[PDB]
Amino acid sequence: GIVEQCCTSICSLYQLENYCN
Amino acid sequence: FVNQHLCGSHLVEALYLVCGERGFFYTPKA
Numbered sequence: 001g002i003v004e005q006c007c008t009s010i011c012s013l014y015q016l017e018n019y020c021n
Numbered sequence: 022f023v024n025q026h027l028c029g030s031h032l033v034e035a036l037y038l039v040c041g042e043r044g045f046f047y048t049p050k051a
């Protein structure tokens with residue numbers, strides 16, 4: 001769901017950090 | 022589904038700048 005989470009509505013840098021290693 | 026295709030190109034780029042030295046794995050799913 002990265003895509004469903006971020007392509008349907010905008011993601012913040014901060015939600016983005018969660019897909020980091 | 023060139024649309025998700027367009028979108029993940031920009032997402033991996035935001036991820037590259039956000040994860041920095043840590044990396045990230047990019048799954049087009051789950």
Ligand SMILES: Cc1cccc(O)c1
Nearest residue numbers: 006010011031032035
């Ligand atoms: C930073 C960024 C890139 C592409 C899509 C988004 O929801 C967010």
